[PDB]
Every structure is written in C-alpha cells, then in structure tokens.
Amino acid sequence: VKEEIQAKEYLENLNKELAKRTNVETEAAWAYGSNITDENEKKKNEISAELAKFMKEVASDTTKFQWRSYQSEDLKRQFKALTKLGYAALPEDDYAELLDTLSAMESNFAKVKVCDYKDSTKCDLALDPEIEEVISKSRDHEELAYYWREFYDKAGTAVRSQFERYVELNTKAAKLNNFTSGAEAWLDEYEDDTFEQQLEDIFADIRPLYQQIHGYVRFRLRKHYGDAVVSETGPIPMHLLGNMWAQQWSEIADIVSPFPEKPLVDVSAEMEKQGYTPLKMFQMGDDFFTSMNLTKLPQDFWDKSIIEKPTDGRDLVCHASAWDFYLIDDVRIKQCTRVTQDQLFTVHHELGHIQYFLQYQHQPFVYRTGANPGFHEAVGDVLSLSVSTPKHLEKIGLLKDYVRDDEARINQLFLTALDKIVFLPFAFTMDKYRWSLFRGEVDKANWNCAFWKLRDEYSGIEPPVVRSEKDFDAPAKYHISADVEYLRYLVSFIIQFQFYKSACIKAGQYDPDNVELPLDNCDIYGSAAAGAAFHNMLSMGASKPWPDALEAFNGERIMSGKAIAEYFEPLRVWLEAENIKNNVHIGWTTSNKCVS
Ligand SMILES: *[C@@H]1O[C@H](CO)[C@@H](O[C@@H]2O[C@H](CO)[C@@H](O[C@@H]3O[C@H](CO[C@H]4O[C@H](CO)[C@@H](O)[C@H](O)[C@@H]4O)[C@@H](O)[C@H](O[C@H]4O[C@H](CO[C@@H]5O[C@H](CO)[C@@H](O)[C@H](O)[C@@H]5O)[C@@H](O)[C@H](O)[C@@H]4O)[C@@H]3O)[C@H](O)[C@H]2NC(C)=O)[C@H](O)[C@H]1NC(C)=O
Ligand SMILES: *[C@@H]1O[C@H](CO)[C@@H](O)[C@H](O)[C@H]1NC(C)=O
Ligand SMILES: *[C@@H]1O[C@H](CO)[C@@H](O)[C@H](O)[C@H]1NC(C)=O
Ligand SMILES: [Zn+2]
C-alpha cells in the first residue's frame, strides 16, 4: 500500500536514531567497564534506563503500522526486531533494579582479590593476571586447591542473593515479551524451533571422542599426581586441568601429551624472546585480516582501544571484549593483553568481532549484529585455527626446528582437542544450568548442587573440595556474573570448523585425498578466496536468517558436526587404539563433592 512506503521511511529514520542513542549507551558502558566507580555505574545505568524507555515508545509505535500485512520481507523483518524489547519491557522501577543487580554482580566479579598462598599479608592477587597464572602453571595440587576455593567463595557465593533477584527479573522480562522464560528469549536469536534438539544431536555424536580424551587425560594425571589425588574411576578434580573453570585443558598439555619426546607447540617463550608486545600482536592480527583482502583496522581502533592492563591500580573488567559504537569506524577492544600463545589466539578472536562490525556497518541499525550470536564468536576463531598451525607459526618465526612427523601431528591434534573438544560439554552446561533456573525446573534449595550435577554428567569433572548449598559457584564464571548468553560459544566451536574447512578448500590448502594438504595444517593467511567468502557472509549482518548467511559463505544451510569430526578423525583413530592398548578406564562414577 501507500503505508508500506511511509513505513520504509519510518524505519530508515528510526534506525539512525537508535544507532545514535545506542552510541551514547555504549560509551557510558565502556567508561564503566574500563574504570569501575560508583559514578560511572550510575551514569551507565541512567543512560540505559532512558534508552529502555525510548525502546518501549518504539515498540508501541510499531502497532500503528499494519506491518504483518506488508509485501516486503525486509520491512517485516526490521519491524519484528523492533517489537523484541528484552529487558526494556520491564516497568521502569523493575528495569532500574535489574541494572543495579547486574552492576553489583559484574563489579563483584571484577574486584575479586585473594591472599597469596605463601604470604597472607599480600592480599592483592586478581584473577587477571595473578591467579590465572598460578592455575595455569602450578603443578602443586594443594596450592591449586587453595586458589580454587578462595576464588569461588568470593566470585561465586558472595552474589547468591543478587543472582536470585536477577533470575526473577529475567523471568518477568521474558514473560512480558510472551516467552515462557529467559531460555526461550535467548533461543529466539537462533530463529529455529528445533535448535536445542539440533545441538543435542551434534553433542551426542562428539561425546564419545570427549570421553576418550577425558579417559586418557585422567590416566596421564594419575601418573603425575598419583592415585591419592586422582582416582581411576571418578570425575577428574577440576583444579588440575590448567583453568579455573576447566573449560579448556591446553595449559596442562606438557604433562598429558601423547608423545612427550616429540615437539609440542608452545610459542610463548619465543614471542617473549623476540620482544613481542600487545601492540605487535594486534598489528599481526590486523595483518592477517588485510592479507585476506578484508578490512584494515581504522585509526579510532588504535587511538581508543585498551590493549594493556592499566597500571594505575584502578578497578576495571579485564575479561577481553570487543565494542561497536554504531557510528562509522568507531570500534574498540578492551583486553588486558599478555605475551603468550593463548593470548595471541584471543587477539585474533576479538579482532573477528571488530571485522564483523566493520563488514556490516553500512547496514541499518537492527541488522548490525551477527547472523546469530554463534556466528559472531566464530569469525576470529577461524583465523586462530590457522594461526595455531605449525605451518603458520614457522612462517612468522615463532616455531623453530619443527619436524612434522606422525607423532608431532598427534601431539598438535591433541593440543587442539584440549581447547576445542573439551570445551563443548563445558559450554553446553553453562546454558543448560541457566535455562533450568530460568524455566523454574530447580528449587532454590538445590541450585548449587544442580550446577555441579551438570558439570559431572557432561564433563566428568568435580570441585577439589566438598561444596554444599551453603556455596554458590556458578557466578564464579565471568559470563554468569555479567549475564552473557553462553550457547553462542557452543555454536561457535561447531560452526567455526564448517567455516575453516570451507575456507581451507577455497584457499587450496585442503584436499581430503592428498596427504600433503591435511585440514589440521591449513593456513588461510593471504587467501583472497577465503576473504571473499567472509565478505559475502559478514556484510549481511542480521539482514537474513542465519542459514542464508552460511549459504553465502559456502552454499550450505545446515549447522553440522561433520567438519569438527573430520578435523579430529586422525586423533580419534589414534586415541581409541592408545586407550585400548593401555587399558584406560573410560567413564566416571557420580561425584560426591556436592552435599545436599
Ligand atoms: C502478550 O500476550 C498478551 C495476551 O496474553 C497480549 O496482550 C493483549 O494484546 C492485545 C493487543 O496486542 C490487547 O487487545 C486489546 O484489547 C482491548 C480490550 O481488552 C481489555 O479487556 C480485557 C478483558 O476482556 C482485559 O484483560 C485487558 O486488560 C483489556 O483492558 C481492545 O480495546 C483492543 O481493541 C482495539 O484494537 C484493535 C486492534 O486491531 C488491530 O489493528 C488495527 C487497528 O488499528 C485493526 O484494523 C486490525 O485488524 C487489528 O485487529 C482494533 O480493532 C480496535 O481499535 C479495537 O477497538 C485490543 O483488542 C489485549 O487487551 C491484551 N491483553 C490481553 C490479556 O488480552 C500482548 O500484546 C502480548 N505481548 C507482546 C509483546 O506481544
Ligand atoms: C575514572 O572515573 C572517574 C569518575 O568516577 C574519573 O574522574 C576518573 O578520571 C577516571 N579515571 C581514569 C584513570 O580514567
Ligand atoms: C579484493 O577485493 C576486490 C574488489 O572488491 C576483489 O575484486 C579482489 O579479489 C580482492 N583483491 C585482491 C588483493 O585479491
Ligand atoms: Zn567473542
């Protein structure tokens, strides 16, 4: 009708206004996140409250248009997105209380300090970097357990009453948008009613490999720590796995690697010896993208980013993140960067977000996000997969005197699995837990043990000490304290293998029927063929449902476990044999580390 013509002009104008108002909210959030004070908290929450109020006016104005009657799929999609208010649907007082609750949790988490194990006078150890360094480096099980407990008590238990209020307010918000719970609100971002089932099916296919890796790691840990510390048949004590949440185990690769007489890629020491800085690491990431004929970082990036931990003793959120300011070319990273191999991957991870932001900044505001949350998280990881290859690391002079025999290949495959397969059950449990609270499936009296129950069922790990319903451990993970959906990372770790396989084929770097070009040594550095595929997909933003974005990249429309399995198939074959040959116990008894 004539109405659809006016509507298109309504949208064009409203999109620009939302960008500009979001800009101002993002600036205040940035200011808080990079400098936590009471004054910046109030500024952030007051701006948010005002944007919330305007969003409600907008939702209500969508009803004045017959938008579901229109011809244009594109107009209807944009209107649909403006009806989805999220937390902004709350009454203004409930919204302000929710923001205050979220602030309390995120700043509790960011301000955690603990006492040194060897010196209880020295009480200024932060997660990043001091506690993370001990967890990743110490092989003293008693020190490890000490830091685990100190951290979980302060980051987790201390915000129980706040976490509860947040679940209530999150649930109320979802119901006001006519979702059953916050779980359905999160899942709506994947635009697919069978999405949970799809992930269950993929997870069930990779679980057997996970159990083989688990079994082997447990066997190797028993030889290091002995049977008093690690049982044969029980869940692995999580504090021994190189990471505070046992989400990835690559930091203990030096004690669990298949062939310890053969090389294991660890380039941290060479980075340090070649004088690498944070600045250099970001410049390398930048080079990687521009090498593929993708977009160079703008000057605002270099001028406004924070790529090193401030040295002025202020409080900030050190958890690494990427920020879109919704103008032109104002994109930033906040990373407390350290010169290590894992941090090099993180740098590429974060720069994948930046690239996505630049690729879609010509889109209308509602379309300036990922095709789905998982797509956003995968982009940088596709590059990190290349960066991590011995091929790439020899090219940039970080890996010296490396012979890629069959045993070094198994070592590298295993190292990657400790980051990529191990994480899958972990990532699944973070949202399974929250979903189950959001949906009202667990009584408040059982919330802590329901967490550790899932961590046992899916990952076969447990706490180093007995916990109970007096503790509350979930918020000790950043994203749980900060209310960041975690499924995006599960989706990412599956789909990034679909992107990488396809990028590798396009780059001439992978042929199944040619042993010179195996998937696990593919480097896509310099490939404009791969870059083109990325451009086609990333530039779409959220303008189409995600199957359409994937189709733009490689012609497929389906999320699949095929690629991640193909990548690790040589590992699976070897590891199955090695477990049988060493009579390794697979599976685990129920944990008894959480008392009701
Ligand atoms: C979540 O789900 C909620 C339901 O569970 C839903 O809430 C409902 O939304 C309806 C509109 O979205 C709303 O409808 C209005 O009802 C008015 C009368 O209802 C009152 O009495 C109820 C008991 O009987 C009370 O419980 C309520 O609290 C109400 O106070 C009507 O006056 C009103 O009507 C007018 O509006 C229609 C709209 O027509 C549409 O648009 C054009 C009009 O420009 C039409 O040409 C077109 O065909 C189309 O129909 C007009 O026909 C005309 O002006 C009417 O007079 C309207 O029906 C309903 O009251 C409300 N609550 C409940 C519980 O029913 C939420 O909307 C959902 N939330 C989200 C985010 O989607
Ligand atoms: C942190 O924020 C305060 C406002 O609460 C401001 O005055 C101060 O300059 C900021 N500090 C830094 C280092 O930016
Ligand atoms: C970069 O992009 C151009 C135009 O968009 C494309 O045609 C070309 O393949 C790319 N250039 C290089 C360096 O390969
Ligand atoms: Zn990310």
Residue numbers in the entry: 19 to 614
Describing publication, verbatim:
Angiotensin-I-converting enzyme (ACE, EC 3.4.15.1) is a promiscuous zinc metallopeptidase with a number of substrates, including the vasoregulatory peptides angiotensin I and bradykinin, the anti-fibrotic agent N-acetyl-SDKP, the neurotransmitter substance P, and amyloid-β peptide. Here, we present the use of the Drosophila melanogaster ACE homologue, AnCE (which, in particular, shares enzymatic properties with cACE), as a model to study the structural basis of ACE inhibition.
IW-1 isoleucine and VW-1 valine sit within the S1 subsite, forming a hydrophobic contact with Trp341. Due to the similarity of isoleucine and valine, the interactions within the S1′ subsite for VW-2 and IW-2 are conserved. Based on this, it is likely that the difference in the dipeptide affinities towards AnCE (IW: 0.08 mM, VW: 0.17 mM) is influenced by the difference in hydrophobicity, with a more hydrophobic side chain being favoured. The tryptophan binding within the S2′ subsite is conserved between IW-2, VW-2, YW-2, and RW-2, where the tryptophan side chain forms hydrophobic interactions with Phe441 and Tyr507, a π-stacking interaction with Phe511, and a H-bond with Gln266. The difference in affinity between IW and VW in AnCE is likely due to the extra carbon atom in isoleucine, which has an effect on the van der Waals interactions within both subsites, potentially further stabilising the dipeptide compared to VW. The S1′ and S2′ subsite changes between AnCE and cACE could result in higher affinity binding of the IW-2 and VW-2 dipeptides within these subsites due to the changes from AnCE-Thr364 and Gln266 to cACE-Val380 and Thr282, respectively, resulting in more hydrophobic pockets.
